[PDB]
Amino acid sequence: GSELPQMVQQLNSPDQQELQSALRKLQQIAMGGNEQIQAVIDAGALPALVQLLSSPNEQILASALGALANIASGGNEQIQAVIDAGALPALVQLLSSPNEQILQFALIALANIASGGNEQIQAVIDAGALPALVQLLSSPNEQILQEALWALSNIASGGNEQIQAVIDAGALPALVQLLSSPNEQILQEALWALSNIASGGNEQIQAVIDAGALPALVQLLSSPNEQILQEALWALSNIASGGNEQKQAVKEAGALEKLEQLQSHENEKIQKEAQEALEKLQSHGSGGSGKRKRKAKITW
Ligand SMILES: [Ca+2]
Ligand SMILES: [Ca+2]
Ligand SMILES: [Ca+2]
Ligand SMILES: [Ca+2]
Ligand SMILES: [Ca+2]
Ligand SMILES: [Ca+2]
Structure with a gap:
């Protein structure tokens, strides 16, 4: 007042x-x-x-x-x-x-x-x-x-033009290398950033594929850490929202078997996210990728 x-x-x-x-x-x-x-x-x-x-x-x-x-x-x-x-x-x-x-x-x-x-x-x-x-x-x-x-x-949670600026600034190689981080906080953030990039157009998704993200994402589908598992599922799910070339790259990286298995995970969020990613990969048609934003406060 x-x-x-x-x-x-x-x-x-x-x-x-x-x-x-x-x-x-x-x-x-x-x-x-x-x-x-x-x-x-x-x-x-x-x-x-x-x-x-x-x-x-x-x-x-x-x-x-x-x-x-x-x-x-x-x-x-x-x-x-x-x-x-x-x-x-x-x-x-x-x-x-x-x-x-x-x-x-x-x-x-x-x-x-x-x-x-x-x-x-x-x-x-x-x-x-x-x-x-x-x-x-x-x-x-x-x-x-x-x-x-x-x-x-x-x-990268912006529109396709904003995502393209992130790609053009050269962020992808570093982000893909961070998928090997043993630091779970870093790993989670690298997954958020890559998922947001893969929320763009088919050409933005293809840039994520071309930077080599798929082998590491597929390996993270074996993680016993349920938070990391959900994050990898989200990323794969955004990638699978692309066109045929994008869907096919995900199949060639071996994702189908693991995604099918993860439908039997006890955790209901994992089940549902695995089922959704599998449906997109097997569907004809595209879209349905999710963007996420983070806000933080500074207090002492
Ligand atoms: Ca660690
Ligand atoms: Ca340090
Ligand atoms: Ca666990
Ligand atoms: Ca200093
Ligand atoms: Ca001063
Ligand atoms: Ca004074």
């Missing part, structure tokens, strides 16, 4: 303690759902938060990133408000920060923006985020790699 305007004014306070305190309060209010996010936006916070993305004060910067990430966990129009206030160029530049905490928070903010509609995703692409994000797939820092992967996965 009547304290938000003061909090917004304090984002320019010459008292650093008042400034920090207002920033933290806005960050926390924006954890409270879309009506609370709207009240923050309506109070005028966005221009000041964006401006603070240039601050050389790391405490300010980390809290500003948290506040913006939380705002961008709202509705597509709330995300669009962040984009319209100018946040993308500053966020993209922060992908080159040598400060791993700042980098992680920038990646989460960007990933949340890329969880909006196709226009919001396209704004992330147009700001030049893709080559940085693909380069971060090489990081030996698991925390950074994980947040980059979610940002890429979210971009």
